[PDB]
Amino acid sequence: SVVAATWNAVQLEDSLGMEVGYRLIPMVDFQQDGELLGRIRSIRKKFAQDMGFLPPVVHIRDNMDLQPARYRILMKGVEIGSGDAYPGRWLAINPGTAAGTLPGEKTVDPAFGLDAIWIESALKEQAQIQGFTVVEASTVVATHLNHLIGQFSAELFGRQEAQQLLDRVSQEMPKLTEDLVPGVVTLTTLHKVLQNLLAEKVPIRDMRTILETLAEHAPLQSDPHELTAVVRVALGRAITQQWFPGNEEVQVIGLDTALERLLLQALQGGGGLEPGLADRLLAQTQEALSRQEMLGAPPVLLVNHALRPLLSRFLRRSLPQLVVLSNLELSDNRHIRMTATIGGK
């Protein structure tokens, strides 16, 4: 009787959990209204169809030590996000364009930081005329969970997630899968290159091109560091058209003609720089980001292919918003213009 109570306090290990305040229990229980439950699997399906893999299910239950309207999202036990959701009220978000003001609790949306107001339902039509995006309560939690899942797509993608990706893809594409793992490339390294792509916001939707590429390079090379760059080049048209959608002008961040030279000889064995230059490199990268942001341009640093993996992991530990692309990853049929530069004069 009591013997099974002990083993189920210890059975816990949820890869993504959300603890909820008591007034947000209704939208979480199937017997009251499951409006958040339908929201959570809606966003889980889109993520499977936008990112490539199905995320671990969110298991949610109560926590009375937190305030009534506050939800906490946390990943395998460590906290990633939080915020308020008032079930009786609506969130009126302003994307800067809408005109005017509205009464109620002044706040900012939990995902992007836009100015927002919590409003009563009678004023729902008010904010819509003004141009404010009126958003329900269950949605604020779902949209914030969706945004935080995408920010942590790589970490959510563990060894067990790669195998169910293998399984799902092994049966529509059987000829590309039976010989591949563990024949060509091992499952350990197979998982680490798709995680490498997710950590740089590169989607995994096209598994065919990813596996077709591996069949040709992985037989006599299984460093996940080099296979990632090889796979990235194969996905080069999708990478281009997601940060440069359409056929407009590719305005990138560039490196100094002397810095890139000095940077190559560091890895080339002919002399690494003073540490102060490395901190100086980080400094102008921040100014290049804010510059490209002051002209309304994507935060893309277009780089020599040999320098791409280094500067990517070196500059994104501190500036995660930066995107570091290779010259081989950008398409041919695109006209380039450097708008910001790191290391100038």
Author numbering: 348 to 692
Sentences copied from the publication:
We found a new orthorhombic crystal that diffracted up to 2.8 Å resolution, with unit cell dimensions a = 71.7 Å, b = 96.2 Å, c = 114.1 Å and the asymmetric unit containing two FlhAC molecules (A and B). The residues from Val-349 to Val-357 in FlhAL of Mol-A form an α-helix, which interacts with the hydrophobic dimple of a neighboring Mol-A molecule related by a crystallographic symmetry. Trp-354 fits into the hydrophobic dimple, and Ala-351 hydrophobically contacts with Pro-442 on the periphery of the dimple. Ile-7 and Tyr-10 of the N-terminal α-helix of FliS is in the corresponding position of Ala-351 and Trp-354 of FlhAL, respectively. Tyr-10 fits into the hydrophobic dimple of FlhAC, and Ile-7 interacts with Pro-442 of FlhAC. These observations suggest that FlhAL and flagellar chaperones bind competitively to a common binding site on FlhAC and that the dissociation of FlhAL from this binding site is required for the binding of the flagellar chaperones to FlhAC. When Ala-351 and Ala-356 of FlhAC-ED in the crystal structure were replaced back to the original Glu-351 and Asp-356 residues, respectively, the side chain arm of Glu-351 can form a hydrophobic contact with Pro-442, suggesting that FlhAL can bind to the hydrophobic dimple of FlhAC even in the wild type without the flhAED mutation. Because the introduced Ala residues would increase the helical propensity of residues 349–357 of FlhAL as seen in the crystal, we suggest that the flhAED mutation allowed residues 349–357 of FlhAL to efficiently form an α-helix to stabilize the binding of FlhAL to the hydrophobic dimple of FlhAC. Far-UV CD measurements revealed that the flhAED mutation did not affect the secondary structures of FlhAC. These suggest that FlhAC-ED adopts a more compact conformation than wild-type FlhAC. Unlike wild-type FlhAC, FlhAC-ED and FlhAC-EWD did not bind to immobilized GST-FlgN at protein concentrations less than 10 μM, indicating that FlhAL with either of these two mutations inhibits the binding of FlhAC to FlgN.
